[PDB]
């Protein structure tokens, strides 16, 4: 079938979407470790706006804590809590 223009534009419009974020990029200081899973699912703002002069940005954020396997080469490894920043509201605003 075809996805009607109405449905396409709505689903792609600026909103919080589940996104897989690499842990190193959220904890670049903890580069001495290896994480399992190396990627975590986080609600992040994504999608397109009604004009090119606007950008999808978060308006209210929140923290979420997840259990991650932290591995240090040849020293040890354990499940540890790690906090991550998630987006609860998004809005299109000028660049």
């Amino acid at each position: 079938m075809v996805v009607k223009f109405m449905d396409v534009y709505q689903r792609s419009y600026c909103h919080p979407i589940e996104t897989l974020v690499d842990i190193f990029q959220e904890y670049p200081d903890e580069i001495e470790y290896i994480f399992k899973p190396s990627c975590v699912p986080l609600m992040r703002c994504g999608g397109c706006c009604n004009d090119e002069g606007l950008e999808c940005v978060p308006t209210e954020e929140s923290n979420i804590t997840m259990q991650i396997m932290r591995i240090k080469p040849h020293q040890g490894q354990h499940i540890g809590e790690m906090s991550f920043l998630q987006h609860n509201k998004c809005e299109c605003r000028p660049k």
Binding site: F5, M6, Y9, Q10
Partner: protein, 216 residues
């Protein structure tokens, strides 16, 4: 205390479309369970009439009934300024309550209808606003609706519009604004939105203004 009465006029759309049936509604509140019977007597320009429609009493959360009576009226009768009186008799009332209602007297005046597209500043939101200005009309009885040529695929739940109640303008006429909220892509894709106004001072009691996206 005692029960109270409220007499409401017909819907403007009903008085202006021959297909529809206008009706005057007499509502009685604060009716006790001990004395729940209400007798309605209707009069038109003083003469009594017996085509009244009785509604089943309705229990309210405050342990009291809401008794209603509905009188259907002729379109020309209401528009010609006939007076409709509802007389209410209840065991808890020492004297029956009377209420009258009639169309506002005054030279009818034709509404002007103007439609405005969204402001460019509003594009920062997914939903945009279409505007319909209706001014210069008398009496205040008027009906305003929105239509779209968009198939039900576009608006399966109908159109989301709300309208200000009419208020008096500086020239003795009434004016209002109706705001239609639609998703931007429905405006962008060329959907044609229409503001339909029904008023007695209009030819055929009906007019319409159309609105659609414009490209340079």
């Amino acid at each position: 205390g005692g029960p109270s009465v409220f007499l409401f006029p017909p819907k403007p759309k009903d008085t202006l479309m021959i297909s529809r049936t206008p009706e005057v509604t007499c509502v009685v509140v604060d009716v006790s369970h001990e004395d729940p019977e209400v007798k309605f007597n209707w009069y038109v320009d003083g003469v009594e009439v017996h085509n009244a429609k009785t509604k089943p009493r309705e229990e309210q959360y405050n342990s009291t009934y809401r008794v209603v009576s509905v009188l259907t009226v002729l379109h020309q009768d209401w528009l010609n300024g006939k007076e409709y009186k509802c007389k209410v008799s209840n065991k808890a009332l020492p004297a029956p309550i009377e209420k009258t209602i009639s169309k506002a007297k005054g030279q009818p005046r034709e509404p002007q209808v103007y439609v405005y597209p969204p402001s460019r500043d509003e594009l920062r939101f997914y939903q945009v606003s279409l505007t319909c200005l209706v001014k210069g009309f008398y009496p205040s009885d008027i009906a305003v609706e929105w239509e779209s040529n968009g198939q039900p695929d576009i608006f399966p739940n109908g159109l989301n519009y709300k309208t200000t109640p009419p208020v008096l303008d500086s020239d003795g006429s009434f004016a209002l604004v109706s705001k239609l909220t639609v998703p931007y892509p429905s405006w962008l894709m060329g959907t044609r939105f229409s503001c339909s106004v029904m008023h007695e001072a209009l030819h055929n009691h009906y007019t319409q203004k159309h609105l659609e996206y414009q490209w340079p």
